[PDB]
């Protein structure tokens, strides 16, 4: 089998991508938030504390024939952001694109925290990294993809985040048309629970490459890449302008500006992000100052390959025996 369906960011600066999402019988629809860093499928639902809801589209498993309590399992979790949620769980049909588990954990919000409460646009999120790091207890579950793996024709999926644009997560098939070139894979470490791997080394717009090993995640769920200290400060230093804000919590730099691309290495590939791509507009409505898309990783403890890095790219998350992800330009 294989599914393919569409994904498009919640707003004008791709602060988040959302997909539609089947639950239950007849077919509730949410939109959810595909989580490469994360392992629980979570939604809104008619348990979350009605304070809590603002405009989300809820799941209500009362109105599933499908759905089944799951009986004493709970689920609470912390995101690397501050924010939270938790719940209990039912199992139901899930579909993604015409792909279809049944069976599915889906966690049911009782409480989310205030930054989930104030997205109306984003129903819940869909887990992709390994199911090591799913939070329910006390029989932890399997995600989307670790359900389907074995009925799809090939045990892959893939992200095409688009720029201010949709773009296509593809399940048990790679589509040759979707990229330019070759895919280069590259090796992934599984230890922490997240797809891991390790680039090759960066440049700042037209300059040298460097040759020096960075490890981090590839995370969809994550919006800005988050780099070592001193990488970042080496491409903010290409803009006039450009500082760390302590007050803001992070690079700022003058609207005005027009920014370097920063391209990363996957083995001997390269992939370029644009300049363009960087930017995350006035740090406040009608400021110019803006807030920077490249920023440090200094105090999270990992580089994390999130949207910025990922939508210049064609990524293949490879969910064979040994995991690898692949990265073509496009």
């Given at each position: 089998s294989t599914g393919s369906a569409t994904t498009t960011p919640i707003d004008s600066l791709d602060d988040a991508y959302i997909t539609p999402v089947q639950i239950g019988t007849p077919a509730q629809t949410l939109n959810l938030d595909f989580d490469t860093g994360s392992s629980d499928l979570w939604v809104f639902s008619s348990e979350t504390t009605a304070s809590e809801v603002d405009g989300q589209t809820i799941y209500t498993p009362s109105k599933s024939t499908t759905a089944k309590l799951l009986s004493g399992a709970t689920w609470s979790i912390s995101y690397g952001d501050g924010s939270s949620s938790s719940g209990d769980v039912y199992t139901d049909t899930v579909s993604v694109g015409g792909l279809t588990v049944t069976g599915q954990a889906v966690e049911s919000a009782k409480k989310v925290s205030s930054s989930f409460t104030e997205d109306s646009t984003i129903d819940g999120l869909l887990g992709l990294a390994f199911s090591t790091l799913n939070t329910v207890s006390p029989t932890q579950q399997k995600t989307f993809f670790d359900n389907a793996k074995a009925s799809l024709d090939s045990p892959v999926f893939t992200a095409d985040l688009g720029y201010h644009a949709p773009g296509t997560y593809n399940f048990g098939?790679?589509?040759?048309?979707?990229?330019?070139?070759s895919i280069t894979y590259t090796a992934v470490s599984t230890k922490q629970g997240f797809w891991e791997w390790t680039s090759t080394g960066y440049a700042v717009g037209s300059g040298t490459f460097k040759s020096t090993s960075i490890d981090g995640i590839a995370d969809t769920g994550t919006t800005l890449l988050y780099l070592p200290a001193t990488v970042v400060s080496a491409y903010w230093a290409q803009v006039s302008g450009a500082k760390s804000s302590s007050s803001v919590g992070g690079y700022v730099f003058p609207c005005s500006a027009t920014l370097p691309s920063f391209t990363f290495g996957v083995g001997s590939a390269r992939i370029v992000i644009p300049g363009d791509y960087i930017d995350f507009g006035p740090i406040s409505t009608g400021s110019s100052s803006c807030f920077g898309g490249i920023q440090s990783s200094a105090g999270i403890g990992i580089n994390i390959f999130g949207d910025v890095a990922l939508k210049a790219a064609f990524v293949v998350f490879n969910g064979a025996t040994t995991p690898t992800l692949g990265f073509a330009s496009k």
């Open positions: 098939f790679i589509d040759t048309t979707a990229y330019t070139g």
